[PDB]
């Protein structure tokens, strides 16, 4: 089971957002993000959640959290909406 937040952001072309992939299983066999944007994760203390910073996002985009748990593999998408300046 995963959860992503924010679920949807709007941000100005070339902006940045951090998203947080959180899993329910408290020591997930594997937990990350699947996106074609450029990404950098952060300070972990703990493995329930990773926090990825998607920087300089240029066009409308999507991002998808996954977590491989005891129960199964879960997915959750977050929509990045970008507007021009």
């Amino acid at each position: 089971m995963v959860s992503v937040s924010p679920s949807k952001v709007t941000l100005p072309r070339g902006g940045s957002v951090l998203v947080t992939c959180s899993a329910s299983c408290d020591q997930p066999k594997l937990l990350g993000i699947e996106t074609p944007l450029v990404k950098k994760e952060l300070l972990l203390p703990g493995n329930n959640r990773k926090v990825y910073e998607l920087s300089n996002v240029q066009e409308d985009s999507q991002v998808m959290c996954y977590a491989n748990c005891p129960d199964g593999q879960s997915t959750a998408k977050a929509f990045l909406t970008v507007y021009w300046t």
């Binding site: 594997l30 699947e34 996106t35 074609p36 990404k39 998808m64 996954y66 491989n68 593999q73």
Partner: protein, 180 residues
């Protein structure tokens, strides 16, 4: 010596759609430049799950690599490479699906190795596997190690970065080994 070569290609979301197109255009370039009998082909796209885009049976029949991959849809979901290899091993190299039994079996994996599953590829040991790394996400400690995990040994002989296809002289004069 006959060779059964399978393209396992990454259609996960982590690859840009123009990057994906580059992978198709790559497989077509390889098949075009190997239209002799010795090589028999088959391609499977993997993302969250797997689908074989064409059989050996299909290559042996249609034989037009342009029209063989013409109906691919970019899957655009997770990158489950580990089970992808297992699928090729158990589900693509088959008597029924047109594989030659005597043929020495090769695998070309094209991914960024940002893989979203874990496991073992023991089921595909005897399949000699060149893996080639495209993608902005293949630039990390994990990804790199993941790439080398899929490779035949010694690793740094079966792993390269795609370029604008420079291997089409490199890999090729080493893929002209297998035909004998």
């Amino acid at each position: 010596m006959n060779v059964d070569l399978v393209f396992l290609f990454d259609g996960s979301m982590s690859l840009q759609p123009d990057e994906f197109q580059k992978i198709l255009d790559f497989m077509k370039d390889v098949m075009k430049k190997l239209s002799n009998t010795s090589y028999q082909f088959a391609a499977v796209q993997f993302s969250t799950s797997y689908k074989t885009e064409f059989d050996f049976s299909d290559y042996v029949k249609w034989k037009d690599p342009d029209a063989l991959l013409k109906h691919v849809k970019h899957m655009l979901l997770l990158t489950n490479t580990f089970g992808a290899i297992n699928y090729v091993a158990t589900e693509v190299f088959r008597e029924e699906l047109g594989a030659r039994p005597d043929a020495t079996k090769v695998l070309i994996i094209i991914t960024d190795g940002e893989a979203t599953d874990s496991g073992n590829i023991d089921a595909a040991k005897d399949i000699i596997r060149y893996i080639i790394g495209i993608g902005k996400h293949s630039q990390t400690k994990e990804s790199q190690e993941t790439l080398h995990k899929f490779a035949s040994k010694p690793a740094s002989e079966f792993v390269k970065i795609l370029d604008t296809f420079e291997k089409l002289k490199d890999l090729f004069t080493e893929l002209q080994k297998k035909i004998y």
